[model samples]
Target: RTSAKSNLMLILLGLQMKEISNSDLYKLKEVRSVVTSLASFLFQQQNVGVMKSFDSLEKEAFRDLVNRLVSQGLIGLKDKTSETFDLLPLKNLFEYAEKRISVLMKLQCYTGTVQLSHVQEKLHLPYITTNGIVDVFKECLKRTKKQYPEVLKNWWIDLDNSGILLHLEYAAAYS
Candidate 1:
């Protein structure tokens, strides 16, 4: 893990010194890939000897990446938070899982045949399902039913299980 720490060191060093080279962005991508990989890895292999370590490493990697982007002075705070994407408390994190699944699904808000399975890969199946967060997503779907049920015609999920079926108007296709 010291290797990752060294990478963070160099990452921040480059940020602070105004070097801000192309290598910096490349290294940043390298670090982000690791975070996603660990998220994937931990999502599947639970109850392992290194589970706690993997959890902690994922957290650190995320926070490190966030810290780098935040202080880069490259973007506005709210705008940065809007695009870039935390967890000391998985409990609190669960609440956010609902909102996240909400917006991500809303991207296909008009699609009559959307499924939670499609979003699983985006969050990594591990993070989405482990800790039983998929249930949280189902609950969020219910919230979506209430929150914006008829952005066009009508919206509801089905006996189709994961599919959130919708009836979209011709207006749905336009801005």
Candidate 2:
């Protein structure tokens, strides 16, 4: 059976594997140590011979996680050293839509509405089609409806030949 420390390491590993940074690992020093120890123990358990030192195990695990996330298109390295990461825009559609909506709301002073075209331009999504835009807007609406139903009480999305229009309302009035 795995120890409590190993369990905690697994939890942290699952939480931030997509975009873990060296600084992030440093902040969780104890957890990182546990991970390294567990990795070494597992290697020995499998008869893989003497395991590497803590630093080497940590580096190997971090690199492997980064490679996995990159392969899945969830994140990208900012430079050759891979010290930093960039989250891919389309990796989590709902969260991306939520971010876009939040930005548009802020730009409009959290009261006025914004056109769909404005959001599309601001997002500058790569290689997106018309249907993709529609999908993004739909996801935005769905997320807002679930997370902030008050935002939708007075706000709405109106579809027309011109395009989709997002109507934002002040929070006080909704509250």
Candidate 3:
């Protein structure tokens, strides 16, 4: 069982190396993109559903892991560390998609005529089904709106090409 897990991790590392080697893949800088990349690698195991099973670490742990990986490289950290470092991209893999879906759905809820396909195309959420995105986003929006009503009220509606450019710019700056 342990050897199987090790082999799976090696496969993930190989996939990640392949992905990072791609020149075009760098265009996606959002946490979603990173999470997707990481998930694609990690969830290759038949039993590991990346989106469903991954857990979020504290921000400090996340920061430390990133720094450690970038500094020492993944190979150097193995056996040296006492802790189990599950290096899944937590925020991107699950949280950001959920957040973006929520924000988009709120705007969609306001504009009854616009279909989710339009939003999915606009947001580049090709992996998620329109209905799936809507359902999750609505659920997230419902809870968020209840706790922080002001947050959704200030939502951005006019996501034109310029808005998209700005979003990309912000995401680039953020990531």
Candidate 4:
């Protein structure tokens, strides 16, 4: 059974998947809760939502983080909420949420190219169910490529410095 806390966290994670901007984050209590949860989950030793645990100092830190995210355009702010905290968009953030899942899917699909039996020996998933998973991944890839070209292009290269190519060699490699 899932704990209410974790279940709530999952719901917030879904909201985070939908909304990637600070302005979108502020539009709903749920989104704000999720951003705080996501940042806390990634960076803090104790994974408490900001709503549950943010002090003045912590609030300032979160504010700075949100401000930086907004200013950088990784997230967007709503014109209506221009006076307050920024909100993000559902579509923009989906790229991040989907990429993690897609990478896992790709690793699974790699077996199709390499041969399932060989991949199974290396990966250790149940032998009874390899082909179905690969088929599903192919279907997902087709759908995603056609439906979300922006996501398929992997837009986060603009946001994350680590994904950028500073050298010509690296740029050629990236392309």
Per-residue lDDT tens digits for candidate 3, residues 33-63, read 4444454445454354433444332222233
Model 3 Cα displacement at 154 (Å)? 16
Q: Measured by TM-score, how close is model 3 to the native structure? A: 0.24
- Which has the greatest lDDT? 2
Q: Which pairs clash in model 2?
A: none
TM-score versus the correct structure, for each prediction: 0.25, 0.35, 0.24, 0.28
**Model 2: runs farther than 4 Å from truth?**
1-42, 88-175
How many clashes in each candidate?
1, 0, 1, 9
Q: Where is model 1 poorest over a 10-residue stretch in terms of lDDT? A: 84-93
* Candidate 1 backbone collisions, by pair: 43-126
Give lDDT tens digits, candidate 2, residues 4-24: 332342343345445555566
What local lDDT does model 2 show for residue 150? 53
Error of 3 at 81 (Å): 26
- Name every residue pair that clashes in candidate 4: 18-90, 21-87, 21-88, 22-86, 22-87, 23-86, 23-87, 24-87, 24-88
TM-score of 2: 0.35
Q: Show where candidate 3 strays beyond 4 Å.
A: 1-111, 149-175
TM-score of 4: 0.28
Could you tell which candidate, 2 or 4, scores higher by TM-score? 2
